[PDB]
Design a protein around this ligand. Sequence first.
Ligand code: NI
Length: 341
Amino acid sequence: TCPFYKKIPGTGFTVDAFQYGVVEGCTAYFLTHFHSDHYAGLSKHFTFPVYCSEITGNLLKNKLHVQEQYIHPLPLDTECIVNGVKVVLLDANHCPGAVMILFYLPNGTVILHTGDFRADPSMERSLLADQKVHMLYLDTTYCSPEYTFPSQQEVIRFAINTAFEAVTLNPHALVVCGTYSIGKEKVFLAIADVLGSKVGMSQEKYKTLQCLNIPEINSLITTDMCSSLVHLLPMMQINFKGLQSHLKKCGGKYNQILAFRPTGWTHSNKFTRIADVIPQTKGNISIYGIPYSEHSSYLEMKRFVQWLKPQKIIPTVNVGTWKSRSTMEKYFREWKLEAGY
Ligand code: NI
């Protein structure tokens, strides 16, 4: 059944709750972003109102074929009224079109639902600064102190410098980047920009990117693989067998592959700095796992919460085990005692 952490009290609303059939009492279904564990269940047969960003609404219409009459896009940073309740959508710093949602309950309670987010100090100067938030529905993906990672800018610097050096040493090297969802487009777009190439990809993936309102996108991507030396493939193909196979397909235009796997976290983070990352190599193929995260680190999460000072926290991730739930609740209490709220 629909879990309680997907329901908004004092409303008929649910958040990211599309795989439970008709939720009894739900008058509006919000969708924070277009990732499959969140939209699971949506299709052309859905006949309830869906509230989301413009970009998520483009994806619902073009990729899932949801009928336009049931898609309600909202502008960001704007007080809107939905079924009699004031709401605001804020940028979540996750993937394209991802939002956090502020609900202003008729009884005076304010609730923030982060969706999936990567906390940032810039959030401390949005509309969140203007009133108190009582309850926080929190993306706790990396809520444990082992989870450190570098800034996105540091990671993209490494990738740009690595790729440019390799292709300048060998003009017959191919760059390959893995993907399995929207998100992390800066990785392949930044590499292609330093090399003066467009990024080549499948027709399905090109369609997906053309929904994202990225400026000048027609200048940066293409479905002509032959004219490109940065290729995008399914994350599943980013291994030695998959890459050897791909190289055979390029007809001797290339003699070396340099590949990137933008992972979340990996246990080489606790020891190794970004400057010191190395690839796995077999023959003329090298694979780099780079820690490009679109979720908060532990310290970023902690700073956001200690700034916001909520009265109650409801985790939305890692809630399935008692050991995880108990651990998270311990950190929340530490943060509260340290900061004095
Ligand atoms: Ni997500």
